[PDB]
mmCIF file of C-alpha atoms and ligand atoms in Angstrom:
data_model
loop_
_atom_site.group_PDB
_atom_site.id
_atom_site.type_symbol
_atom_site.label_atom_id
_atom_site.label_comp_id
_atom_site.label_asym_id
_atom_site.label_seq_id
_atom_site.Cartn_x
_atom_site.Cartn_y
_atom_site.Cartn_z
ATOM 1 C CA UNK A 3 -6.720 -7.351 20.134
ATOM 2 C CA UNK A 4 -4.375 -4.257 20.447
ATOM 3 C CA UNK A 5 -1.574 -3.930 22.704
ATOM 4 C CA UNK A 6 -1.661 -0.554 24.568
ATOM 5 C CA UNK A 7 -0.379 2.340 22.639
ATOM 6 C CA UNK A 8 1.361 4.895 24.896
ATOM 7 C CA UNK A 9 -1.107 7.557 25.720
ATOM 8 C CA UNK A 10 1.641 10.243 24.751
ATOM 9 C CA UNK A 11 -0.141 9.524 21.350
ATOM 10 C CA UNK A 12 -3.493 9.899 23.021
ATOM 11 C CA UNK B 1 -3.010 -11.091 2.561
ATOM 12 C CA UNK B 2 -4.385 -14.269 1.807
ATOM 13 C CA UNK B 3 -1.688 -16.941 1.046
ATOM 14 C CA UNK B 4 0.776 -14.688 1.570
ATOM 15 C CA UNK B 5 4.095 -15.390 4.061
ATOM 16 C CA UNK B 6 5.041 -13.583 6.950
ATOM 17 C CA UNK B 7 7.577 -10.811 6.326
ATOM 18 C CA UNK B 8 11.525 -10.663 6.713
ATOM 19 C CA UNK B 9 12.307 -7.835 9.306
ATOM 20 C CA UNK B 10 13.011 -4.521 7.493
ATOM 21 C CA UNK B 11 11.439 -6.160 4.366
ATOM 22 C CA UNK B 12 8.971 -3.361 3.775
ATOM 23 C CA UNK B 13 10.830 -0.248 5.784
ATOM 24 C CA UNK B 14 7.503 1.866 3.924
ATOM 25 C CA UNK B 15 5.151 0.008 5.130
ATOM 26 C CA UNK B 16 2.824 2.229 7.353
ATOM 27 C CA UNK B 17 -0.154 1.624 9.781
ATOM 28 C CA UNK B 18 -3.386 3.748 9.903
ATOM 29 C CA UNK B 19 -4.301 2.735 13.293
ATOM 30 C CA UNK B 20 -7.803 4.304 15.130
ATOM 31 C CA UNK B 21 -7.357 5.705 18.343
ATOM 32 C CA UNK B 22 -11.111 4.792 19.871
ATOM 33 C CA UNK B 23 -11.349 1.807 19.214
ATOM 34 C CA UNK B 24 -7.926 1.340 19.191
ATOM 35 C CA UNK B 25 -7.926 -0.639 16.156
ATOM 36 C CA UNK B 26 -6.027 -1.402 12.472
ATOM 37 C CA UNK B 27 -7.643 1.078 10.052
ATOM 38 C CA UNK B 28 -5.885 0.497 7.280
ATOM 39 C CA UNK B 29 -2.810 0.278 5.717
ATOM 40 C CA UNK B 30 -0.199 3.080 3.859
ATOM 41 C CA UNK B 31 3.202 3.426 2.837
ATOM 42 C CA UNK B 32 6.318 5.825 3.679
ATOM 43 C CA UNK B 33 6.890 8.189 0.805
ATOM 44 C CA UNK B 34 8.651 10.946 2.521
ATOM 45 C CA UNK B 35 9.904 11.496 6.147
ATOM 46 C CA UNK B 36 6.496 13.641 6.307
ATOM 47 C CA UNK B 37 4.301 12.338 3.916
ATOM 48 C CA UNK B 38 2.143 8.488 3.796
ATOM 49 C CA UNK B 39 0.504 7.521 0.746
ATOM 50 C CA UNK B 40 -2.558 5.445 1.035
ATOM 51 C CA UNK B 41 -6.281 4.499 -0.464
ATOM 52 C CA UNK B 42 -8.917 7.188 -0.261
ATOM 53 C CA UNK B 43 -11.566 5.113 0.753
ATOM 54 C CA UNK B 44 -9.489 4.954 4.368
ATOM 55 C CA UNK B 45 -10.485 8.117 5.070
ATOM 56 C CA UNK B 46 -13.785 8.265 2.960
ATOM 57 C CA UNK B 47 -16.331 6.233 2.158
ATOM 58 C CA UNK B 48 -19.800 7.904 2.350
ATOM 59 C CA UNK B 49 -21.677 4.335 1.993
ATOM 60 C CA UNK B 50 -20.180 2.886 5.169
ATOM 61 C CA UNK B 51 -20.211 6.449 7.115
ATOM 62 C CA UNK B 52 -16.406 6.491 6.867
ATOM 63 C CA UNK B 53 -14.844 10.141 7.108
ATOM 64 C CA UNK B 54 -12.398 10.176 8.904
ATOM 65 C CA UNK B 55 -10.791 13.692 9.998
ATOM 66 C CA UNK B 56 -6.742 14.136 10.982
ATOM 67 C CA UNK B 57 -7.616 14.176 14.713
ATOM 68 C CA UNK B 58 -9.076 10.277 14.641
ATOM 69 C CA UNK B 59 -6.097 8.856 13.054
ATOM 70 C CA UNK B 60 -2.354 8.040 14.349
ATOM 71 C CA UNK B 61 0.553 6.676 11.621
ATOM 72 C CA UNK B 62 2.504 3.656 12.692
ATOM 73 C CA UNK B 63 5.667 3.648 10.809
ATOM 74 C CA UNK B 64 8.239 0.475 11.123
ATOM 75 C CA UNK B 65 5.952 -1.970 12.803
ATOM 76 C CA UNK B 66 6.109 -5.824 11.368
ATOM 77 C CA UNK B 67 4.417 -6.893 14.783
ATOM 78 C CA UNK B 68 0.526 -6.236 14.091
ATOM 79 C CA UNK B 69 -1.261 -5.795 17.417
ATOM 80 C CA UNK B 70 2.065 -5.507 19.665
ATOM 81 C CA UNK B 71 3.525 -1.740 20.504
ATOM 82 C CA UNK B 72 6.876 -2.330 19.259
ATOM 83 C CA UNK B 73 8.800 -0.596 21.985
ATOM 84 C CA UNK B 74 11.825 1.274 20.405
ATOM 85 C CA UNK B 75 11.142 -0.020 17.547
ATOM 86 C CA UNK B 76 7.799 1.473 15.753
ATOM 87 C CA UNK B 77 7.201 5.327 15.533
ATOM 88 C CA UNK B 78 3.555 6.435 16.086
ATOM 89 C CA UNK B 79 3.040 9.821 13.967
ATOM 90 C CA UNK B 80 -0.067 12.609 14.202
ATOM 91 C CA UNK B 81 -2.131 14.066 11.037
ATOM 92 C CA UNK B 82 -1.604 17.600 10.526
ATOM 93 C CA UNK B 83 -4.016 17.556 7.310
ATOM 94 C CA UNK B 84 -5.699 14.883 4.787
ATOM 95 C CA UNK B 85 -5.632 15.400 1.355
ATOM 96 C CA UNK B 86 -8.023 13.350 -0.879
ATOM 97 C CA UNK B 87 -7.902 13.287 -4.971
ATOM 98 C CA UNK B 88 -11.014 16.253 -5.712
ATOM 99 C CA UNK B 89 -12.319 13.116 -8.249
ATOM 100 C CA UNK B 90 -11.985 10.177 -6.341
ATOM 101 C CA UNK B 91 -14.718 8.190 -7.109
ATOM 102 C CA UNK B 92 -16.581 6.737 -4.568
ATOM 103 C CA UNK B 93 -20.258 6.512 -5.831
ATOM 104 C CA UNK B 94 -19.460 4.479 -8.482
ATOM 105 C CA UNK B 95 -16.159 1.984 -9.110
ATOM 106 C CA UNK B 96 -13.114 4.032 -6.356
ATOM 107 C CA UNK B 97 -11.808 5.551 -9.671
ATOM 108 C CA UNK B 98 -8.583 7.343 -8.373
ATOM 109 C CA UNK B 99 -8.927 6.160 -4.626
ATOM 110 C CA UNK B 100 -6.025 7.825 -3.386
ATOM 111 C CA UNK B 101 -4.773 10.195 -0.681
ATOM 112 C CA UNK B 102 -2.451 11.836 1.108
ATOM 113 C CA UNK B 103 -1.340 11.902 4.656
ATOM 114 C CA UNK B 104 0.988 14.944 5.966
ATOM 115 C CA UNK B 105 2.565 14.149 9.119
ATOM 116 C CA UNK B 106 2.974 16.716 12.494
ATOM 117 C CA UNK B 107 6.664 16.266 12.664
ATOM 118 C CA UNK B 108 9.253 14.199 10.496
ATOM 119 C CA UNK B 109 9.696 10.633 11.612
ATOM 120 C CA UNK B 110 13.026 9.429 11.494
ATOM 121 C CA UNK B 111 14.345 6.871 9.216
ATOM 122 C CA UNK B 112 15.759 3.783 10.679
ATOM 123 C CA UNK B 113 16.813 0.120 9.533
ATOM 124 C CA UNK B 114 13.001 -0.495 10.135
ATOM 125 C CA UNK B 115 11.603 2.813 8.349
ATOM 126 C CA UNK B 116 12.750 4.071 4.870
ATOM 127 C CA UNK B 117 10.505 5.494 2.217
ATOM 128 C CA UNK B 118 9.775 3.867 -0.760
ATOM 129 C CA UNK B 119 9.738 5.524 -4.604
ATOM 130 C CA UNK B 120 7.411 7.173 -6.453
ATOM 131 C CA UNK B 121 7.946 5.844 -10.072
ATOM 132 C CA UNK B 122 8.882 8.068 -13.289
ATOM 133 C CA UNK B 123 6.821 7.393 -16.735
ATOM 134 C CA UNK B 124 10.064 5.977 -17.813
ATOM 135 C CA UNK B 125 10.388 3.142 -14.924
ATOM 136 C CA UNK B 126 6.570 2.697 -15.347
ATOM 137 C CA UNK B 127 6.388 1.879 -18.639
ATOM 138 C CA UNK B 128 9.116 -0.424 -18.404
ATOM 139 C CA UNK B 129 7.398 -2.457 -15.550
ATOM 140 C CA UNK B 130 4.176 -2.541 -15.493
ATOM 141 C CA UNK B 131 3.584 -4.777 -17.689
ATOM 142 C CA UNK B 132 1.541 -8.093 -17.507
ATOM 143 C CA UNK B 133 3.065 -11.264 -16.282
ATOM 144 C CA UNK B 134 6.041 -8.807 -14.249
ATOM 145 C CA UNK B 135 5.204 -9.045 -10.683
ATOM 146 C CA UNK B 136 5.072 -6.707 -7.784
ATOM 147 C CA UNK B 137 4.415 -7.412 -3.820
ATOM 148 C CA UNK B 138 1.647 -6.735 -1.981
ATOM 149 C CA UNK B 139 2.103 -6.624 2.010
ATOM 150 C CA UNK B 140 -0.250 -5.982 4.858
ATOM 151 C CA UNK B 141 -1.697 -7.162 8.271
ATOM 152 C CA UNK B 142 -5.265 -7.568 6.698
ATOM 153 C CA UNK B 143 -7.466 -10.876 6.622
ATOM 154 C CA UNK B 144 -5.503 -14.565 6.406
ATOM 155 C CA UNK B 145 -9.006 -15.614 4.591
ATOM 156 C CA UNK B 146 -12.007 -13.876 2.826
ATOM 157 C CA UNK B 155 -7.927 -14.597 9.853
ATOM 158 C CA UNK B 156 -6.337 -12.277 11.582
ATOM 159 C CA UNK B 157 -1.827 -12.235 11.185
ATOM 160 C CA UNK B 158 0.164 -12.024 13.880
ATOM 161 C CA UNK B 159 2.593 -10.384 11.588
ATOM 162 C CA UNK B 160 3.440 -8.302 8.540
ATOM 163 C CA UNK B 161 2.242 -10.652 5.571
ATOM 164 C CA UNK B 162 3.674 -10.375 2.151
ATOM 165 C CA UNK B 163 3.174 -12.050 -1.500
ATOM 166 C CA UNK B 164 4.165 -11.585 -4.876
ATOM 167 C CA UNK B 165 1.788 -11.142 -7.587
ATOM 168 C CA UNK B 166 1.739 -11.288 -11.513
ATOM 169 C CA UNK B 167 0.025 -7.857 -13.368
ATOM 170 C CA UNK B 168 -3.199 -9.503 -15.511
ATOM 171 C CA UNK B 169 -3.020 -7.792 -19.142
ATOM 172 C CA UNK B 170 -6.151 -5.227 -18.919
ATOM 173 C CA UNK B 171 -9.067 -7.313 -20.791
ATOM 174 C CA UNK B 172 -8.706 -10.341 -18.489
ATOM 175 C CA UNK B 173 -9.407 -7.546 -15.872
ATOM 176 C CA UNK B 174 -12.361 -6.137 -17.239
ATOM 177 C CA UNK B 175 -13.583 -9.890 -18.144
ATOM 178 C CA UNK B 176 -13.220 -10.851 -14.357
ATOM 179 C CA UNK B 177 -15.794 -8.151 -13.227
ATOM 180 C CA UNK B 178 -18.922 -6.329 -13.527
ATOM 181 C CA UNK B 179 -17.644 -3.608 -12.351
ATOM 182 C CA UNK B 180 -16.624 -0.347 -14.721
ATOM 183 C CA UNK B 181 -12.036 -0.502 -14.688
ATOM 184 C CA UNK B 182 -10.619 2.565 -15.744
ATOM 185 C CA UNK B 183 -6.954 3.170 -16.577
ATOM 186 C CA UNK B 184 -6.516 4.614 -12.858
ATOM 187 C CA UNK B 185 -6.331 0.802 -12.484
ATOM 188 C CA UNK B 186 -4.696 -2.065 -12.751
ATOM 189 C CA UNK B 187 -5.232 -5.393 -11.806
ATOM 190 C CA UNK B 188 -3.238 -8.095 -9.944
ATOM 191 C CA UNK B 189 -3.625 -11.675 -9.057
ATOM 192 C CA UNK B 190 -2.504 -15.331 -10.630
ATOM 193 C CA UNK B 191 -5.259 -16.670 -13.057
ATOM 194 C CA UNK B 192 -7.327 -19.858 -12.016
ATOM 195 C CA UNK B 193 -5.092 -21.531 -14.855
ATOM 196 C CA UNK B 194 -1.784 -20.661 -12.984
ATOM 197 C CA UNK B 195 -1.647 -22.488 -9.954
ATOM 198 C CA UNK B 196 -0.202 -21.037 -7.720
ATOM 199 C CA UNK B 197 -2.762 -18.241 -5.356
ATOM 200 C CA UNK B 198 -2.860 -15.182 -2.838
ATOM 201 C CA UNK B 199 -4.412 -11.657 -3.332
ATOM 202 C CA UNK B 200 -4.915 -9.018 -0.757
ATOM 203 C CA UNK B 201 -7.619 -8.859 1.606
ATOM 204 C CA UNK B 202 -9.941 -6.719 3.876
ATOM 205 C CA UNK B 203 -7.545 -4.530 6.146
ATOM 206 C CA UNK B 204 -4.737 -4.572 3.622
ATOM 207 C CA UNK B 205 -6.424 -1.245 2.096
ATOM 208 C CA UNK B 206 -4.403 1.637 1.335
ATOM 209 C CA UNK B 207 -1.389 -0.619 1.526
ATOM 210 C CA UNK B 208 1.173 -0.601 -1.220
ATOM 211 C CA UNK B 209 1.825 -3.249 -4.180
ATOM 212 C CA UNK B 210 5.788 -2.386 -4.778
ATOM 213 C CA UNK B 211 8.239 -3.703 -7.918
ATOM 214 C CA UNK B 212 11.757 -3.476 -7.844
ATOM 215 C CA UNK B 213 13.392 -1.759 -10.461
ATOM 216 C CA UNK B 214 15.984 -4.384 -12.189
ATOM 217 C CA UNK B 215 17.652 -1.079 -13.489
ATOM 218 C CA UNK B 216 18.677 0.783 -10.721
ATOM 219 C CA UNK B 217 17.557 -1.846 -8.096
ATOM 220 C CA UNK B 218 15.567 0.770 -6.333
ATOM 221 C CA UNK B 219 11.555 -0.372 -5.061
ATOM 222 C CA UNK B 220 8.844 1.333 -6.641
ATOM 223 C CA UNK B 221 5.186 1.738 -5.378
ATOM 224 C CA UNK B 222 3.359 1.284 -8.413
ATOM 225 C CA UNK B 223 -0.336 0.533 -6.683
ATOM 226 C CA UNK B 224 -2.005 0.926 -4.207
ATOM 227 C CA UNK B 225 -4.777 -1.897 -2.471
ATOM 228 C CA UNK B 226 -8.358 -0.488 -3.505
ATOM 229 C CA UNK B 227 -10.595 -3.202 -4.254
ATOM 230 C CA UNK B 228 -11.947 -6.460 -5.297
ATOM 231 C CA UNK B 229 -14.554 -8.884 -5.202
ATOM 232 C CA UNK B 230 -14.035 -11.663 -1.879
ATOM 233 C CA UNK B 231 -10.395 -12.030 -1.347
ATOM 234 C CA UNK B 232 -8.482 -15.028 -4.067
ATOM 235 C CA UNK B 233 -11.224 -16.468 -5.545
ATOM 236 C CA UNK B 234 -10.446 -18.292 -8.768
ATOM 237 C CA UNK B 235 -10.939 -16.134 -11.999
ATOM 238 C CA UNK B 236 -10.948 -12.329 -9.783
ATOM 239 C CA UNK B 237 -8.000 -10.360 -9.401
ATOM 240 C CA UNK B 238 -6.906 -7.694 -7.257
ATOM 241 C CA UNK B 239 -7.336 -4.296 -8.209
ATOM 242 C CA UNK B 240 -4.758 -1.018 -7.232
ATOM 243 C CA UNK B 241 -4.915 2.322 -7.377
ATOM 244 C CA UNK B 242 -2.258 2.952 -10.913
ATOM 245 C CA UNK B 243 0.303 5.584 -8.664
ATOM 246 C CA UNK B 244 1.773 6.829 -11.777
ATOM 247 C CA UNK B 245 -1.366 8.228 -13.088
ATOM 248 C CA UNK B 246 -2.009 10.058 -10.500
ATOM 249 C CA UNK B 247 1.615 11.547 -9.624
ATOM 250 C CA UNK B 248 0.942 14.660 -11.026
ATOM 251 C CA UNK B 249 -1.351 15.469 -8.502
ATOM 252 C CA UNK B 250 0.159 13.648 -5.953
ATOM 253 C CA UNK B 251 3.353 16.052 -6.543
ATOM 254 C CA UNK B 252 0.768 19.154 -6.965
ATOM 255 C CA UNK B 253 -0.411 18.435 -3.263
ATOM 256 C CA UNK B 254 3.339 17.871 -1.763
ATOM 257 C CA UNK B 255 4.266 21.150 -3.931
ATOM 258 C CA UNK B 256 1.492 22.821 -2.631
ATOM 259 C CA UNK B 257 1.616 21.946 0.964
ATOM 260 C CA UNK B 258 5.642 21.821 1.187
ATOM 261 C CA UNK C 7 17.050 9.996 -2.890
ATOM 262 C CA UNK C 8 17.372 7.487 -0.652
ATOM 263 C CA UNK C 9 14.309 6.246 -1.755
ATOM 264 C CA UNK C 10 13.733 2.874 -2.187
ATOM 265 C CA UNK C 11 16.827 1.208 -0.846
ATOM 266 C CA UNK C 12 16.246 -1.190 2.533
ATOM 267 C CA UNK C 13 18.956 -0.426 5.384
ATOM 268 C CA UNK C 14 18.724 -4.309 6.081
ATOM 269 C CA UNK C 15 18.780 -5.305 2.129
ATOM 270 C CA UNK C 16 19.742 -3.099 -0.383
ATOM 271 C CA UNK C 17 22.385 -0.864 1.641
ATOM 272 C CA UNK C 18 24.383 -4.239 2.847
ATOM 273 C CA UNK C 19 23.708 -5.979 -0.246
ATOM 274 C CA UNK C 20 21.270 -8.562 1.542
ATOM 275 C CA UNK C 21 18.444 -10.272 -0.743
ATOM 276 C CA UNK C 22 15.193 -10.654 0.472
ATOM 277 C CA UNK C 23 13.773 -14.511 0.226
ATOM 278 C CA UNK C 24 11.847 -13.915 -2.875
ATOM 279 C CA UNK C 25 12.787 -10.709 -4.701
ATOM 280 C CA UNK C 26 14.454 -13.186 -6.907
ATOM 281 C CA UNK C 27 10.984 -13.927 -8.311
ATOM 282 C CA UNK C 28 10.619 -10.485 -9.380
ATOM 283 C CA UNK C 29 13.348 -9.900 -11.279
ATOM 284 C CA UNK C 30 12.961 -13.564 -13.321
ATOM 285 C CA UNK C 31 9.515 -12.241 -13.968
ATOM 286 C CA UNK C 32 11.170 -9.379 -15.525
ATOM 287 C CA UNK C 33 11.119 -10.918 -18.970
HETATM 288 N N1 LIG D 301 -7.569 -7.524 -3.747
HETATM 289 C C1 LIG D 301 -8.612 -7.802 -2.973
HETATM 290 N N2 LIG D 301 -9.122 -9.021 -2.973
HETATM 291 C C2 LIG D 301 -9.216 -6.736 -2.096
HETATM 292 C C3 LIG D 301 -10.556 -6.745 -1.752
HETATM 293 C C4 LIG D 301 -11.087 -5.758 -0.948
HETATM 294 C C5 LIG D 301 -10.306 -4.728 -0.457
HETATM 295 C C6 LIG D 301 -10.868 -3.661 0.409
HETATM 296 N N3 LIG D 301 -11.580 -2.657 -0.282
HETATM 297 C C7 LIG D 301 -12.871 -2.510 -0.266
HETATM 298 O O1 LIG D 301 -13.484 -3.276 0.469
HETATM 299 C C8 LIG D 301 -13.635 -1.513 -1.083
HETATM 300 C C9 LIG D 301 -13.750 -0.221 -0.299
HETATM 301 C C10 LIG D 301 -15.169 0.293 -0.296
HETATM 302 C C11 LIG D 301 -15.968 -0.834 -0.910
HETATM 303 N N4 LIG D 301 -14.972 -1.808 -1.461
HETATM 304 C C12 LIG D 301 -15.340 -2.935 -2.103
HETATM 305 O O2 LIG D 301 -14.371 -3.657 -2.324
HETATM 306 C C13 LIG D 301 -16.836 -3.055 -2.428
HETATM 307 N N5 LIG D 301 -17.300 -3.880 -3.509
HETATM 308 C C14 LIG D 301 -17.490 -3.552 -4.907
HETATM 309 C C15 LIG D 301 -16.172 -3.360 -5.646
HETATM 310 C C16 LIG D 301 -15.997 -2.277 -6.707
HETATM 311 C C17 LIG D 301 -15.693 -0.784 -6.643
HETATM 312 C C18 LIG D 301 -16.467 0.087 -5.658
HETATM 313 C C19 LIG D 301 -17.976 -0.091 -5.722
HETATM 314 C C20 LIG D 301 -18.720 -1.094 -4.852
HETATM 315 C C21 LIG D 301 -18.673 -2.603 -5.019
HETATM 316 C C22 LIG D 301 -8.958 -4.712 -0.797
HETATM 317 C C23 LIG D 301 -8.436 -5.703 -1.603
HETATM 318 NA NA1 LIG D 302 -16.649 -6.928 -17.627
HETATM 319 NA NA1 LIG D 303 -7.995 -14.767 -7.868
#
């Protein structure tokens, strides 16, 4: 369902 | 939020996402209190009956999102857990007496027109509002129906004087609590829902026209069914130690 | 200190669609 978070969050 | 309406933008500037990282998924929800500290349920983080403990590592902090699945490019800050804090006498084996934490953040987020805390209310503005029949607002991206929003959902709610409360349940209230909801009688519906948890049920102060978090979503029993209300977390109860933690932990 | 106040309400002296409700509830 989620749209990709930037993985600079992790 | 069931029967609830979508949000304005910058309606609820504290309104904060606890988001998991694997599965990226909607854990929960929590409000802005501080440009370094969220306020939300304690059974987000615990709840031994479920295997739910979650440590600071898991979790990431959405602030200013209205969008619920979308990453809100320039928009939304995403914020890191530097350490959870959970009330020593939450109550989890028996009724979520005192279901309340906090959240200190890595870093500061910055405010915006989309991310602003909200208050934490005095014993003075307290008494003068939380009273049955005044209503507060209850907002979060959890279940449509005891389904899923595409955006920030909101209602407004009427307090239920405290023996209609204890006559809608089974269930032990204490004065941690209050209780939230229209009355089968009243016409008019909508509650909170699954996924809404942790979120914040606000009032706004017709005295210095400032908003107020005066609960927080906990629990109930299905979401809006006639004759059960909504029960929060009473935030005013618990401020000493919520100001003992922040005090503590600067 | 700050607290509480919506840049997009409050600070321009917006209202929200149904913080009216509130306050008449305000008895
Ligand atoms: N206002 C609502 N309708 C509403 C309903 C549910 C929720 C979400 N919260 C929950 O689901 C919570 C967390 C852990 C178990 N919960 C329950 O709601 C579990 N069911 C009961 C309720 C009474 C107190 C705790 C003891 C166990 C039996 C949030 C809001
Ligand atoms: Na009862
Ligand atoms: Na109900």
């Amino acid at each position: 369902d989620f749209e990709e978070i930037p993985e600079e969050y992790l | 939020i069931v029967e609830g309406s979508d949000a304005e933008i910058g309606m609820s500037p504290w309104q904060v996402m606890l988001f998991r990282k694997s599965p990226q998924e909607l854990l929960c929800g929590a409000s802005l209190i501080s440009d370094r500290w969220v306020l939300t349920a304690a059974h987000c983080l615990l709840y031994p009956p479920w295997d739910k403990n979650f440590t600071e590592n898991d979790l990431l902090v959405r602030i200013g999102k209205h969008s619920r699945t979308r990453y809100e490019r320039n928009i939304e800050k995403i914020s890191m857990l530097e350490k959870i804090y959970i009330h020593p006498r939450y109550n989890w084996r028996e009724n979520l007496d005192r279901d309340i934490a906090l959240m200190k953040l890595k870093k500061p987020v910055a405010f915006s027109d989309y991310i602003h805390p909200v208050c934490l209310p005095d014993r003075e503005t307290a008494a003068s509002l939380l009273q049955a029949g005044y209503k507060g607002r209850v907002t979060g991206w959890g279940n449509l129906k005891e389904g899923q929003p595409s955006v920030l959902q909101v209602v407004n709610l009427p307090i239920v004087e405290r023996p209609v409360c204890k006559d809608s349940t089974r269930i032990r209230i204490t004065d941690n609590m209050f209780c939230a909801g229209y009355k089968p009688d009243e016409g008019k519906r909508g509650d909170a829902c699954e996924g809404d948890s942790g979120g914040p049920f606000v009032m706004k102060s017709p005295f210095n026209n400032r908003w107020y978090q005066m609960g927080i979503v906990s629990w109930g029993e299905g979401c809006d069914r006639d004759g059960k209300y909504g029960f929060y977390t009473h935030v005013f109860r618990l401020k000493k130690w919520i100001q003992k933690v922040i005090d503590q932990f600067g | 200190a700050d607290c509480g106040l919506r840049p997009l309400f409050e600070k321009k002296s917006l209202e929200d669609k149904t913080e009216r409700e509130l306050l008449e509830s305000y008895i």
